[PDB]
Design an enzyme around this catalytic site. Structure first.
Site, PDB file in Angstrom:
ATOM      1  N   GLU A  35       0.979  -0.853   0.019  1.00  0.00           N
ATOM      2  CA  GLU A  35      -0.039   0.083  -0.167  1.00  0.00           C
ATOM      3  C   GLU A  35       0.445   1.034   0.063  1.00  0.00           C
ATOM      4  O   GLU A  35       0.578   2.019  -1.398  1.00  0.00           O
ATOM      5  CB  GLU A  35      -0.884   0.011   1.305  1.00  0.00           C
ATOM      6  CG  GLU A  35      -2.438  -0.888   1.151  1.00  0.00           C
ATOM      7  CD  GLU A  35      -2.994  -0.496  -0.244  1.00  0.00           C
ATOM      8  OE1 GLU A  35      -3.318  -0.203  -0.696  1.00  0.00           O
ATOM      9  OE2 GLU A  35      -3.857  -1.521  -0.179  1.00  0.00           O
ATOM     10  N   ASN A  46      -8.472   8.474  -5.406  1.00  0.00           N
ATOM     11  CA  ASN A  46      -9.050   7.944  -6.913  1.00  0.00           C
ATOM     12  C   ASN A  46      -9.495   7.907  -7.681  1.00  0.00           C
ATOM     13  O   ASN A  46     -10.234   9.628  -7.322  1.00  0.00           O
ATOM     14  CB  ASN A  46      -9.359   7.102  -5.103  1.00  0.00           C
ATOM     15  CG  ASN A  46      -8.615   5.853  -4.476  1.00  0.00           C
ATOM     16  OD1 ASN A  46      -8.937   6.149  -3.007  1.00  0.00           O
ATOM     17  ND2 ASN A  46      -8.084   5.005  -4.653  1.00  0.00           N
ATOM     18  N   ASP A  48     -12.544   8.232  -8.152  1.00  0.00           N
ATOM     19  CA  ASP A  48     -14.126   8.942  -8.087  1.00  0.00           C
ATOM     20  C   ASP A  48     -13.578  10.401  -7.220  1.00  0.00           C
ATOM     21  O   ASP A  48     -15.102  10.598  -6.541  1.00  0.00           O
ATOM     22  CB  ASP A  48     -14.879   7.392  -7.632  1.00  0.00           C
ATOM     23  CG  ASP A  48     -13.848   6.915  -5.839  1.00  0.00           C
ATOM     24  OD1 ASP A  48     -13.470   8.077  -4.706  1.00  0.00           O
ATOM     25  OD2 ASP A  48     -13.798   5.728  -5.595  1.00  0.00           O
ATOM     26  N   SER A  50     -11.619  10.203  -3.697  1.00  0.00           N
ATOM     27  CA  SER A  50     -11.702  10.449  -2.643  1.00  0.00           C
ATOM     28  C   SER A  50     -10.142  10.024  -3.016  1.00  0.00           C
ATOM     29  O   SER A  50      -9.054   9.897  -3.950  1.00  0.00           O
ATOM     30  CB  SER A  50     -12.134   8.573  -2.096  1.00  0.00           C
ATOM     31  OG  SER A  50     -11.893   7.688  -3.068  1.00  0.00           O
ATOM     32  N   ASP A  52      -6.773   8.709  -0.483  1.00  0.00           N
ATOM     33  CA  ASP A  52      -6.027   6.992   0.162  1.00  0.00           C
ATOM     34  C   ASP A  52      -5.286   7.816   1.378  1.00  0.00           C
ATOM     35  O   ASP A  52      -4.406   8.583   0.666  1.00  0.00           O
ATOM     36  CB  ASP A  52      -5.489   6.253  -0.202  1.00  0.00           C
ATOM     37  CG  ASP A  52      -6.923   5.400  -1.208  1.00  0.00           C
ATOM     38  OD1 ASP A  52      -7.940   5.000  -0.652  1.00  0.00           O
ATOM     39  OD2 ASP A  52      -6.050   5.713  -2.676  1.00  0.00           O
ATOM     40  N   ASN A  59      -8.585   4.825   3.346  1.00  0.00           N
ATOM     41  CA  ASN A  59      -9.556   6.007   2.214  1.00  0.00           C
ATOM     42  C   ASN A  59     -10.455   6.282   2.578  1.00  0.00           C
ATOM     43  O   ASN A  59     -11.273   6.174   3.501  1.00  0.00           O
ATOM     44  CB  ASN A  59     -10.201   4.696   1.621  1.00  0.00           C
ATOM     45  CG  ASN A  59     -10.801   5.173  -0.219  1.00  0.00           C
ATOM     46  OD1 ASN A  59     -11.217   6.186   0.143  1.00  0.00           O
ATOM     47  ND2 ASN A  59     -10.837   4.677  -0.531  1.00  0.00           N
ATOM     48  N   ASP A 101     -14.669  -5.639   9.290  1.00  0.00           N
ATOM     49  CA  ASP A 101     -15.577  -4.401   8.858  1.00  0.00           C
ATOM     50  C   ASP A 101     -16.851  -6.123   8.007  1.00  0.00           C
ATOM     51  O   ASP A 101     -17.906  -5.652   7.127  1.00  0.00           O
ATOM     52  CB  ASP A 101     -15.810  -3.721   7.916  1.00  0.00           C
ATOM     53  CG  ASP A 101     -16.845  -2.489   6.967  1.00  0.00           C
ATOM     54  OD1 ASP A 101     -17.308  -2.379   8.453  1.00  0.00           O
ATOM     55  OD2 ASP A 101     -17.263  -2.742   6.122  1.00  0.00           O
TER      56      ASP A 101
HETATM   57  C1  LIG Z   1      -8.750   0.537   3.294  1.00  0.00           C
HETATM   58  C2  LIG Z   1      -8.721   1.089   2.339  1.00  0.00           C
HETATM   59  O1  LIG Z   1      -8.812   2.609   2.491  1.00  0.00           O
HETATM   60  N1  LIG Z   1      -8.693   0.017   1.083  1.00  0.00           N
HETATM   61  C3  LIG Z   1      -7.747   0.926   0.252  1.00  0.00           C
HETATM   62  C4  LIG Z   1      -8.678   0.486  -1.075  1.00  0.00           C
HETATM   63  O2  LIG Z   1     -10.001   1.277  -0.887  1.00  0.00           O
HETATM   64  C5  LIG Z   1      -8.565   1.158  -2.673  1.00  0.00           C
HETATM   65  O3  LIG Z   1      -8.528   0.516  -3.346  1.00  0.00           O
HETATM   66  C6  LIG Z   1      -6.975   1.005  -3.029  1.00  0.00           C
HETATM   67  C7  LIG Z   1      -6.367   1.829  -4.025  1.00  0.00           C
HETATM   68  O4  LIG Z   1      -6.534   3.377  -3.060  1.00  0.00           O
HETATM   69  O5  LIG Z   1      -5.675   1.109  -1.697  1.00  0.00           O
HETATM   70  C8  LIG Z   1      -6.664   0.440  -0.660  1.00  0.00           C
HETATM   71  O6  LIG Z   1      -6.446   0.995   0.462  1.00  0.00           O
END
Ligand SMILES: CC(=O)N[C@@H]1[C@@H](O)[C@H](O)[C@@H](CO)O[C@H]1O
Ligand SMILES: [Cl-]
Ligand SMILES: [Cl-]
Ligand SMILES: [Cl-]
Ligand SMILES: [Cl-]
Ligand SMILES: [Cl-]
Ligand SMILES: [Cl-]
Ligand SMILES: [Cl-]
Ligand SMILES: [Cl-]
Ligand code: NA
Length: 129
Positions: A35, A46, A48, A50, A52, A59, A101
């Protein structure tokens, strides 16, 4: 702060991460790696809208508030900048609510795609734990 591998493991284990919801420490440490590269300051936008945030790239869609993700939630009850901190507590405490979750660590794209079903211990090999 760009964490070191065994540093991060120690710090996740302390925050009660190892074997949270059945996920030994090598998982989380892998997840982090992919990550975010162990960088507490990492962001990605992202498509959309958003963003991260941080070590585990949590996110803004669901999890934190940066106040530019329309129609989004803030289920961890934190601003998203608290996830870039060199202290990782917020990051970790949020992980706990996300992992819990019902999609497990599938919640982390990197994880499902790059760590799931591999030898995750390798990431904690050599660690003063
Ligand atoms: C828990 C979380 O936020 N998970 C995100 C996911 O939503 C996203 O598809 C990806 C790329 O941005 O990275 C992950 O870390
Ligand atoms: Cl590494
Ligand atoms: Cl492990
Ligand atoms: Cl917002
Ligand atoms: Cl903006
Ligand atoms: Cl709320
Ligand atoms: Cl806020
Ligand atoms: Cl810490
Ligand atoms: Cl699970
Ligand atoms: Na939000």
């Amino acid at each position: 702060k760009v964490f070191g591998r065994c540093e991060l493991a120690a710090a996740m284990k302390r925050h009660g991460l190892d074997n949270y919801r059945g996920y030994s420490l090598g998982n989380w440490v892998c997840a982090a790696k992919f990550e975010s590269n162990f960088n507490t300051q990492a962001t990605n936008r992202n498509t959309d809208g958003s963003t991260d945030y941080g070590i585990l790239q949590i996110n803004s869609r669901w999890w934190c508030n940066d106040g530019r993700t329309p129609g989004s939630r803030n289920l961890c009850n934190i601003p998203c900048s608290a996830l870039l901190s060199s202290d990782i507590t917020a990051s970790v405490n949020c992980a706990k609510k996300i992992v819990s979750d019902g999609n497990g660590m599938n919640a982390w794209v990197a994880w499902r795609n790059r760590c799931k079903g591999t030898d995750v211990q390798a990431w904690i090999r050599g660690c003063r734990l």
